């Protein structure tokens, strides 16, 4: 298995994770 | 060997393609939500109104700006805004809070930036369309207008002021 | 030389690189000054002194704009996704039109330059109207454009002869991907040039007296949210195709990588209502539209994070590197071509996931029109393609001119990429959070240094990325001079070939492979998702037009 690949993919989703619910929280806030 | 790895990337490739499309749909549900509270008051009218920047100071409601404030509804109120080189009329704007807010922004001139700080509402002003966006003060006091589209040279010192009464 | 007679395609390609990155040295001057700027620091009068023919922090935001995101952006499209597919063709590129192509980008520039550098046209990369250029910024930036209808039928022609030699065999990958590039480009480009030809030009000419802001807005975003695509896919050919080569590794699979590009053709024109998210006019229904379809254009880039990561990650563990991070590493960081682009690929991470912020209708009312657009998409165009553009003169120079890179000369490259690649994480920590401290983009901050004083934090980063990319700026320069100008050359290395990938060895899918290489199909329904995506719309626009005149303020 591609452990390393997956391991990126993992950042890459903690990532746009992070941002998404970071922003919308936001929206929210500023609701 | 390399006749394996193949198998074993596109394998979980095919993984993650699946699980990429699932996050990206919960957004899709979770966007639709806002759509249908609220927070969405905040989104343009999509509807054509057009009007005419050479004489919307001089005729309508653009044009008096101590009465740019109108209560169309039991607990809601029009107000009219005129976004321009380089200000915002009236100064400052007076709603009460609580109350349901109908802007009507435009501009004589160029474009410009209609951004309420701390808050939610950011609408591009066009010259000869008038932008409708609603919101509910939920918090008296003083918020500022940034304009976020550039305008020209005093692009940087154009701001506005919304004063929302207790 | 002898090289020049049999490859010409090397030349005209050798200026279009050249010219886009002297572009890229004029359009980025003006960078350090603007990052100091959004750190609330002045630095202007310094700048006025050295450019005298700069009269505001807003011609220099036309400049930079122009010449970085416009111009070296374009010149290397052309570059890459000419001779790219041509050589692994091995064919010759029509040189009459390869040479028309570089005259015609190169006259436009000039003359789009003349009112630029006098001040005549302040209206940045988005030129919006009412805001009113002269007509040679209109009519030079026309033509500067246009000129990439002379690539797309260049490479159109390469393409044809080779099906033509080769009737029954399916087209070659380098190659699938500079047409599907390129045609996704011919509907992308219908938006500007509707919009040039039926408004700016007519306007900026007198021939009428105003236009419509929000036809023109609509217009301009047709194509202006695919020309980004147009600026990355020139790069992903290299990251698909030939880093791989020079990561010690393959491309783990043809097929993904035929399937990202196709996607990207059928995905990128249809999405530009998530520009126009505050707009006045355009019914929500069509937003959220172009909202989920937006989300759709993510995924080749999903794909594309995997296949490239994966791709590495083999390369990675061909080299001895055994464990999680054993594989990154082994691989060759002492090779900057290898260097500038993984690097940008880190910084497109946060990037893209700015990006899908900001296609989320709603959540885009939080950022649009403040410092985090630009913080998302330098990211993206500024260190992504730009770092991959960068490291590949250190293999496609040599490959043109036989000009040799020293050692010493490596060891620059490395320096620049990184100090490159950090400031641009640096500037991009400064504007993110700026811009939800709600600063304003397209503004100079300083002058109202008392304006936004929450904001004092994310400020030092601001000036912090302004002088460190300034020190990598002036080495990319002093470095693309070392090379440009060396006084020593090798014909062997204008000879040598591309390092161009060998292709994982596994089964694969004919099926899907020749689904895709039906290009006459996909390429009709690209464009009926764009006749359905833009239609209505646009019929309704035209049918209540309203023009309003001009303005200069500056
Ligand atoms: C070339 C440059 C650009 C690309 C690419 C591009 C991509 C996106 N954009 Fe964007 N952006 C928007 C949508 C997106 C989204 C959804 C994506 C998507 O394409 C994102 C997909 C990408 C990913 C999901 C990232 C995956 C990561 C990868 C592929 C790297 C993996 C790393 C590896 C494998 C490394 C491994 C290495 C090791 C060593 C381990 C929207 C809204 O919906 C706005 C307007 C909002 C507003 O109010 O202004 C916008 C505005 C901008 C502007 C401002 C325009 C202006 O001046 O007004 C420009 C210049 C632009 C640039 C670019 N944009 N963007
Ligand atoms: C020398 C490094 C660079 C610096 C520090 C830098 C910094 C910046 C900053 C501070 C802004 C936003 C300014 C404002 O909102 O008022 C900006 C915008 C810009 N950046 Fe750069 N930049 C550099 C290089 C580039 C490169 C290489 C690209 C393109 C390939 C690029 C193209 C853009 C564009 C598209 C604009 C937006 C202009 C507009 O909204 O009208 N950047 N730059
Ligand atoms: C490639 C690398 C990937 C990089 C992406 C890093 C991801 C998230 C950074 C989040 C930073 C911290 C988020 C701020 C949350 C916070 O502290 O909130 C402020 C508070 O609400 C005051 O009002
Ligand atoms: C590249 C560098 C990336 C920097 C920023 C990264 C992620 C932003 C995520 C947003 C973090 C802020 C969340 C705030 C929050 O928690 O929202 C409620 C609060 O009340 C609101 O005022
Ligand atoms: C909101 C929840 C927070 C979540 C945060 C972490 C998300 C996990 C990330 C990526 C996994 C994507 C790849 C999934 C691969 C699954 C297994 C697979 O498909 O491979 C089996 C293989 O075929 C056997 O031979
Ligand atoms: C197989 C497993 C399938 C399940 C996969 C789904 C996992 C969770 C995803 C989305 C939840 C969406 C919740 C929607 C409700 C939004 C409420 C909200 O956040 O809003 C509060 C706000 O204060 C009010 O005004
Ligand atoms: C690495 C990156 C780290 C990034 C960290 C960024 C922190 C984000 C902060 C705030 C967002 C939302 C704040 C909403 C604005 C509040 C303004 C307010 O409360 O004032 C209004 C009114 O006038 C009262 O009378
Ligand atoms: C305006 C004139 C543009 C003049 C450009 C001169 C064309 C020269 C060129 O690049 O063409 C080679 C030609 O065949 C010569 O040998
Ligand atoms: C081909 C080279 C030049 C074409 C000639 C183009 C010159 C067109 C003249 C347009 C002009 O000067 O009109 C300015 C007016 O103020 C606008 O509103
Ligand atoms: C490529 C350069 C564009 C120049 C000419 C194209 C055709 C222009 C035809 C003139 C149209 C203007 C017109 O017919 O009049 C509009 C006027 O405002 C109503 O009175
Ligand atoms: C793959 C493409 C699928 C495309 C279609 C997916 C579903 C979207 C349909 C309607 C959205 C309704 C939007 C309503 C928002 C209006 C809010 C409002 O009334 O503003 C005040
Ligand atoms: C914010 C400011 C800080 C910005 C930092 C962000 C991430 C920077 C680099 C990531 C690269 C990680 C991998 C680096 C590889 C170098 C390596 O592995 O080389 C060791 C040795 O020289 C034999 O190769
Ligand atoms: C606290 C942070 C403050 C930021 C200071 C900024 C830059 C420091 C200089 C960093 C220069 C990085 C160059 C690395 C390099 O050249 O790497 C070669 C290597 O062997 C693998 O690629
Ligand atoms: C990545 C490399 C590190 C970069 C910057 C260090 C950050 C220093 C942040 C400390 C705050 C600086 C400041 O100006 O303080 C705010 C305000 O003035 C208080 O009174
Ligand atoms: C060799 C590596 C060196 C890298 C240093 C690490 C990064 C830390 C600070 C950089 C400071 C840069 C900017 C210094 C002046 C800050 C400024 O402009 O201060 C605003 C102040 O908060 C309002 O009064
Ligand atoms: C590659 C670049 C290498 C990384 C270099 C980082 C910056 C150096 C900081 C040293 C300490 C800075 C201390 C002196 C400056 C702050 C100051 O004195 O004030 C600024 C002034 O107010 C505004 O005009
Ligand atoms: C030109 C636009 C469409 C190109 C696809 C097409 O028609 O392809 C047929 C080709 O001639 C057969 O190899
Ligand atoms: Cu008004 Cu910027
Ligand atoms: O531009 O995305």
Same mark, same amino acid.
């Given at each position: 298995?591609?452990?390393?690949?997956?391991?990126?993919?993992?950042?890459?989703?903690?990532?746009?994770?992070?941002?998404?619910?970071?922003?919308?929280?936001?929206?929210?806030?500023?609701? | 060997?390399?006749?394996?790895?193949?198998?074993?990337?596109?394998?979980?490739?095919?993984?993650?393609?699946?699980?990429?499309?699932?996050?990206?749909?919960?957004?899709?549900?979770?966007?639709?939500?806002?759509?249908?509270?609220?927070?969405?008051?905040?989104?343009?009218?999509?509807?054509?109104?057009?009007?005419? +920047?050479?004489?919307?100071?001089?005729?309508? +409601?653009?044009?008096?700006?101590?009465?740019?404030?109108?209560?169309?509804?039991?607990?809601?109120?029009?107000?009219?805004?005129?976004?321009?080189?380089?200000?915002?009329?009236?100064?400052?704007?007076?709603? %009460?809070?609580?109350?349901?807010?109908?802007?009507?922004?435009?501009?004589?001139?160029?474009?410009?930036?209609?951004?309420?700080?701390?808050?939610?509402?950011?609408?591009?002003?066009?010259?000869?369309?008038?932008?409708?966006?609603?919101?509910?003060?939920?918090?008296?006091?003083?918020?500022?207008?940034?304009?976020?589209?550039?305008?020209?040279?005093?692009?940087? &010192?154009?701001?506005?002021?919304?004063?929302?009464?207790? | 030389?002898?090289?020049?007679?049999?490859?010409?395609?090397?030349?005209?390609?050798?200026?279009?690189?050249?010219?886009?990155?002297?572009?890229?040295?004029?359009?980025?001057?003006?960078? +350090?000054?603007?990052?100091?700027?959004?750190?609330?620091?002045?630095?202007?009068?310094?700048?006025?002194?050295?450019?005298?023919?700069?009269?505001?922090?807003?011609?220099?935001?036309?400049?930079?704009?122009?010449?970085?995101?416009?111009?070296?952006?374009?010149?290397?499209?052309?570059?890459?996704?000419?001779?790219?597919?041509?050589?692994?063709?091995?064919?010759? %590129?029509?040189?009459?039109?390869?040479?028309?192509?570089?005259?015609?980008?190169?006259?436009?520039?000039?003359?789009?330059?003349?009112?630029?550098?006098?001040?005549?046209?302040?209206?940045?990369?988005?030129?919006?109207?009412?805001?009113?250029?002269?007509?040679?910024?209109?009519?030079?930036?026309?033509?500067?454009?246009?000129?990439?209808?002379?690539?797309?039928?260049?490479? !159109?022609?390469?393409?044809?002869?080779?099906?033509?030699?080769?009737?029954?065999?399916?087209?070659?990958?380098?190659?699938?991907?500079?047409?599907?590039?390129?045609?996704?480009?011919?509907?992308?480009?219908?938006?500007?040039?509707?919009?040039?030809?039926?408004?700016?030009? +007519?306007?900026?000419?007198?021939?009428?007296? *105003?236009?419509?802001? !929000?036809?023109?807005?609509?217009?301009?975003?047709?194509?202006?949210?695919?020309?980004?695509?147009?600026?990355?896919?020139?790069?992903?050919?290299?990251?698909?195709?030939?880093?791989?080569?020079?990561? *010690?590794?393959? !491309?783990?699979?043809?097929?993904?990588?035929?399937?990202?590009?196709?996607?990207?053709?059928?995905?990128?024109?249809?999405?530009?209502?998530?520009?126009?998210?505050?707009? %006045?006019?355009?019914?929500?229904?069509?937003?959220?539209?172009?909202?989920?379809?937006? !989300?759709?254009?993510?995924?080749?880039?999903?794909?594309?994070?995997?296949?490239?990561?994966?791709?590495?990650?083999?390369?990675?563990?061909?080299?001895?590197?055994?464990?999680?991070?054993?594989?990154?590493?082994?691989?060759?960081?002492?090779?900057?071509?290898?260097?500038?682009?993984?690097?940008?690929?880190?910084?497109?991470? %946060?990037?893209?996931?700015?990006?899908?912020?900001?296609?989320?209708?709603?959540?885009?009312?939080?950022?649009? &029109?403040?410092?985090?657009?630009?913080?998302?998409?330098?990211?993206?165009?500024?260190?992504?393609?730009?770092?991959?553009?960068?490291?590949?003169?250190?293999?496609?120079?040599?490959?043109?001119?036989?000009?040799?890179?020293?050692?010493?000369?490596?060891?620059?490259?490395?320096?620049?990429?990184?100090?490159?690649?950090?400031?641009?994480?640096?500037?991009?920590?400064?504007?993110?959070?700026?811009?939800?401290?709600?600063?304003?983009?397209?503004?100079?901050?300083?002058?109202?240094?008392?304006?936004?004083?929450?904001?004092?934090?994310?400020?030092?980063?601001?000036?912090?990325?302004?002088?460190?990319?300034?020190?990598?700026?002036?080495?990319?320069?002093?470095?693309?001079?070392?090379?440009?100008?060396?006084?020593?050359?090798?014909?062997?290395?204008?000879?040598?070939?591309?390092?161009?990938?060998?292709?994982?060895?596994?089964?694969?899918?004919?099926?899907?492979?020749?689904?895709?290489?039906?290009?006459?199909?996909?390429?009709?329904?690209?464009?009926?998702?764009?006749?359905?995506?833009?239609?209505?719309?646009?019929?309704?626009?035209?049918?209540?037009?309203?023009?309003?005149?001009?303005?200069?303020?500056?």
């Amino acid at each position: 298995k591609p452990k390393g690949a997956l391991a990126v993919i993992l950042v890459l989703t903690l990532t746009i994770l992070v941002f998404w619910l970071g922003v919308y929280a936001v929206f929210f806030a500023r609701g | 060997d390399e006749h394996k790895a193949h198998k074993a990337i596109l394998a979980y490739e095919k993984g993650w393609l699946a699980f990429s499309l699932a996050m990206l749909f919960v957004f899709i549900a979770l966007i639709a939500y806002t759509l249908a509270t609220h927070t969405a008051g905040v989104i343009p009218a999509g509807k054509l109104e057009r009007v005419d +920047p050479t004489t919307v100071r001089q005729e309508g +409601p653009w044009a008096d700006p101590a009465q740019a404030v109108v209560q169309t509804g039991p607990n809601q109120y029009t107000v009219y805004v005129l976004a321009f080189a380089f200000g915002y009329q009236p100064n400052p704007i007076e709603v %009460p809070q609580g109350a349901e807010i109908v802007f009507k922004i435009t501009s004589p001139d160029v474009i410009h930036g209609f951004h309420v700080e701390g808050t939610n509402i950011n609408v591009e002003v066009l010259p000869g369309e008038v932008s409708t966006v609603r919101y509910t003060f939920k918090r008296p006091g003083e918020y500022r207008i940034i304009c976020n589209q550039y305008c020209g040279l005093g692009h940087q &010192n154009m701001f506005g002021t919304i004063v929302v009464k207790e | 030389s002898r090289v020049y007679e049999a490859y010409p395609e090397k030349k005209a390609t050798l200026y279009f690189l050249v010219l886009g990155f002297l572009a890229l040295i004029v359009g980025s001057l003006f960078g +350090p000054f603007q990052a100091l700027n959004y750190g609330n620091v002045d630095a202007y009068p310094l700048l006025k002194r050295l450019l005298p023919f700069v009269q505001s922090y807003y011609q220099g935001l036309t400049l930079h704009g122009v010449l970085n995101a416009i111009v070296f952006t374009q010149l290397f499209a052309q570059a890459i996704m000419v001779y790219l597919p041509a050589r692994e063709l091995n064919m010759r %590129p029509n040189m009459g039109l390869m040479w028309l192509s570089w005259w015609m980008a190169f006259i436009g520039l000039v003359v789009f330059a003349l009112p630029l550098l006098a001040n005549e046209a302040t209206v940045l990369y988005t030129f919006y109207p009412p805001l009113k250029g002269h007509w040679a910024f209109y009519l030079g930036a026309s033509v500067f454009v246009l000129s990439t209808w002379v690539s797309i039928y260049i490479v !159109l022609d390469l393409w044809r002869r080779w099906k033509a030699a080769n009737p029954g065999k399916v087209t070659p990958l380098v190659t699938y991907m500079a047409v599907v590039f390129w045609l996704m480009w011919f509907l992308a480009s219908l938006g500007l040039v509707l919009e040039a030809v039926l408004f700016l030009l +007519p306007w900026s000419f007198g021939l009428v007296e *105003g236009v419509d802001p !929000l036809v023109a807005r609509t217009l301009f975003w047709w194509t202006g949210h695919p020309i980004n695509y147009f600026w990355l896919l020139p790069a992903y050919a290299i990251i698909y195709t030939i880093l791989p080569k020079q990561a *010690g590794g393959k !491309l783990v699979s043809d097929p993904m990588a035929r399937l990202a590009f196709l996607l990207f053709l059928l995905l990128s024109t249809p999405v530009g209502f998530h520009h126009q998210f505050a707009d %006045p006019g355009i019914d929500p229904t069509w937003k959220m539209i172009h909202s989920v379809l937006t !989300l759709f254009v993510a995924v080749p880039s999903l794909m594309t994070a995997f296949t490239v990561a994966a791709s590495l990650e083999f390369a990675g563990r061909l080299r001895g590197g055994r464990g999680l991070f054993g594989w990154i590493r082994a691989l060759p960081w002492d090779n900057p071509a290898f260097v500038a682009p993984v690097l940008g690929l880190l910084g497109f991470i %946060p990037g893209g996931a700015g990006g899908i912020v900001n296609a989320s209708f709603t959540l885009d009312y939080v950022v649009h &029109n403040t410092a985090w657009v630009p913080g998302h998409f330098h990211l993206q165009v500024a260190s992504l393609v730009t770092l991959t553009a960068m490291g590949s003169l250190y293999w496609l120079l040599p490959n043109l001119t036989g000009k040799p890179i020293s050692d010493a000369q490596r060891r620059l490259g490395l320096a620049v990429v990184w100090l490159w690649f950090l400031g641009m994480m640096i500037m991009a920590v400064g504007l993110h959070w700026a811009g939800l401290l709600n600063v304003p983009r397209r503004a100079y901050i300083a002058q109202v240094p008392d304006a936004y004083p929450h904001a004092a934090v994310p400020m030092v980063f601001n000036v912090l990325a302004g002088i460190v990319l300034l020190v990598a700026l002036l080495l990319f320069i002093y470095g693309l001079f070392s090379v440009l100008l060396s006084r020593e050359r090798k014909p062997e290395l204008a000879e040598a070939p591309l390092p161009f990938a060998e292709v994982i060895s596994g089964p694969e899918d004919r099926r899907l492979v020749l689904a895709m290489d039906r290009i006459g199909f996909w390429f009709a329904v690209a464009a009926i998702l764009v006749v359905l995506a833009y239609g209505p719309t646009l019929v309704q626009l035209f049918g209540h037009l309203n023009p309003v005149p001009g303005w200069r303020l500056w």
